[PDB]
Design a protein around this ligand. Structure first.
Ligand SMILES: CNC(=O)c1c(-c2ccc(F)cc2)oc2cc(N(c3cc(Cl)c4c(c3)COB4O)S(C)(=O)=O)c(C3CC3)cc12
Length: 562
């Protein structure tokens, strides 16, 4: 069937959409080529709609059915609980999309009468009705990028599809405990979300080293969400039901599957009927878990069909990397073509064909790659990096304009060991926070798709836990990484690293003078900026911080707050 059917009605904005990076003195200090920086808007929705709309042809085979049996067996070891209304309410982020039925996220979080009343009725309806499709809103995501003229100009807006706030809370009640436990249980070491950046790096390096002659590749499925069929989504339901569940949970899960997850009508912001969906909804609780599971099942089956030897997989939503034992250059190339053929048959063809890589650093996944630097003693230290263009573009935007839930803070935490994150982003954002007298204010940040409340002053302990003490002492970065950063700075009109160093010395001084946690920020985060280096010992606060929930599971588009 067709992934979508359209009425011809437009995807419409809620509010004013800014296309270009606003001019602001503080943002300009980071990035001056503002004309290169743009935000996606509803104006490009039609372009996206065209790309994501196609007929799915799915043919399953014995390898697929074999893996699915394995998955169901693994799922059967899981015991999952219903969450209460109150519990589910508290997992709702403050800026979550308000209900059409007279309440919003603040009302949900405060357990307000009108909110809870509607939620209770939605739950009841789920238990009583297992067939009537549930309405969804379609919106155009507003995301910031840098223009790449050679690569076809401007990216079209991604489409987000989500049900009403009331339904979203009910999803949590039925499935939050399932999506939290199931992927790890089924996928084990292949489950990407379980790892901190430091752990992820270690996993990849050990996997690579475990092979006599390693070969690796990333597999990029074209429009993954659209490739997910009705049968795929119903299979996900079957897997969920393999758990030991509450009787009411079982009913609600089936209802949510048939009325929401498998498909439904699409309504724009003006209440107009846009069309009908027969594929994955981006904005539901099970999007992350579902995508990861389905990708895993298909990939694991495809590895067998392709005759890949001693496979180690890593899966994060629709992002997939396979590391295996090489059979020779031409043998590997053919096996990879076979892998693609199998994945295609499973309804997941690639955007660009995958290529075998024989160097770990050459593999790009989740926009990221492994690189090497050196610690204080001169020991080789591996870390995850990425092209800084998009992070810098977004950093500039989020400086110029207040965004309720930022991306810059998460970005800094996750890419803390990187040259660009340390010298540019840390320096810039601490300078901005100081200038605006916001150093002590907690911020709402997006991490692995989930909303977190983070205090900037807690950066050092957080970084220590996620990356190790070495993150504060890395030097002698690779020529390739240095060159990539350099190219980005020239492109975006960002001051050179030596200028940032100077600024960092000032910021460091200001932070040290304030004392306490601020002083620790100055000491640890900016030790690179001084010749006379301070002795970086383990941070006492780091041990105390409760960070376990961080890398328990993936909640992207899942409307989750921690
Ligand atoms: C299946 N692939 C993987 O699991 C990952 C590989 C990878 C695997 C194999 C390989 F060969 C190369 C890269 O690298 C990763 C790096 C991250 N990292 C990111 C963190 C952030 Cl805030 C962003 C990004 C990445 C991209 O743009 B950002 O919005 S990180 C630094 O580890 O936290 C992630 C996180 C979960 C998304 C996943 C993967």
């Amino acid at each position: 069937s067709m992934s979508y059917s359209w009425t011809g009605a437009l995807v419409t904005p809620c509010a004013a959409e800014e296309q270009k990076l606003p001019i602001n003195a503080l943002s300009n200090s980071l990035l001056r080529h503002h004309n290169l920086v743009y935000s996606t808007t509803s104006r490009s929705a039609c372009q996206r709609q065209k790309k994501v709309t196609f007929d799915r042809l799915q043919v399953l085979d014995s390898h697929y059915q074999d893996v699915l049996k394995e998955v169901k067996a693994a799922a059967s070891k899981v015991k999952a609980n219903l969450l209460s209304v109150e519990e589910a309410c508290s997992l709702t982020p403050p800026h979550s999309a308000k209900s059409k039925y007279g309440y919003g996220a603040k009302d949900v979080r405060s357990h307000a009468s009108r909110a809870v009343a509607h939620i209770n009725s939605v739950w009841k309806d789920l238990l009583e009705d297992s067939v009537t499709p549930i309405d969804t809103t379609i919106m155009a995501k507003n995301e910031v990028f840098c223009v790449q003229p050679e690569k076809g100009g401007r990216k079209p807006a991604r489409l987000i599809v989500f049900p009403d706030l009331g339904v979203r809370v009910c999803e949590k009640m039925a499935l939050y405990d399932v999506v939290s436990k199931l992927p790890l249980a089924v996928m084990g070491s292949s489950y990407g979300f379980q790892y901190s950046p430091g752990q992820r790096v270690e996993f990849l390096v050990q996997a690579w080293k475990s092979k006599k002659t390693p070969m690796g590749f990333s597999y990029d499925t074209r429009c993954f969400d659209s490739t997910v069929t009705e049968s795929d989504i119903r299979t996900e339901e079957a897997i969920y039901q393999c758990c030991d569940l509450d009787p009411q949970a079982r009913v609600a899960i089936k209802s949510l599957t048939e009325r929401l997850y498998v498909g439904g009508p699409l309504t724009n912001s003006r209440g107009e009927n846009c069309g009908y969906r027969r594929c994955r909804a981006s904005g539901v609780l099970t999007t992350s878990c579902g995508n990861t599971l389905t990708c895993y099942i298909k990939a694991r089956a495809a590895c067998r069909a392709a005759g890949l030897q001693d496979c180690t997989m890593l899966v994060y939503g629709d992002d997939l990397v396979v590391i295996c034992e090489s059979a020779g250059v031409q043998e590997d190339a053919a096996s990879l073509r076979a892998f693609t053929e199998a994945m295609t048959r499973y309804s997941a063809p690639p955007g660009d064909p995958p290529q075998p890589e024989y160097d770990l650093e050459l593999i790009t996944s989740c926009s990221s790659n492994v690189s090497v630097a050196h610690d204080g003693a001169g020991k080789r230290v591996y870390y995850l990096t990425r092209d800084p263009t998009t992070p810098l573009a977004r950093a500039a935007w989020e400086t110029a304009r207040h965004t309720p839930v930022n991306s810059w803070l998460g970005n800094i935490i996750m890419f803390a060991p990187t040259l660009w994150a340390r010298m540019i982003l840390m320096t810039h954002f601490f300078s901005v926070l100081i200038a605006r007298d916001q150093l002590e204010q907690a911020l709402d940040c997006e991490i692995y798709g989930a909303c977190y409340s983070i205090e900037p002053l807690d950066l050092p302990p957080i970084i220590q836990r996620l990356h190790g003490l070495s993150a504060f002492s890395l030097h002698s970065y690779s020529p390739g990484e240095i060159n990539r950063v350099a190219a980005c700075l020239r492109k975006l009109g960002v001051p050179p690293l030596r200028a940032w160093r100077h600024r960092a010395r000032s910021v460091r001084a200001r932070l040290l003078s304030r004392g306490g946690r601020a002083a620790i920020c100055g000491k640890y985060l900016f030790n690179w900026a001084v010749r006379t280096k301070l002795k970086l010992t383990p941070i006492a606060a780091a041990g105390q911080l409760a960070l376990s929930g961080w890398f328990t599971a993936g909640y992207s588009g899942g409307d989750i707050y921690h």
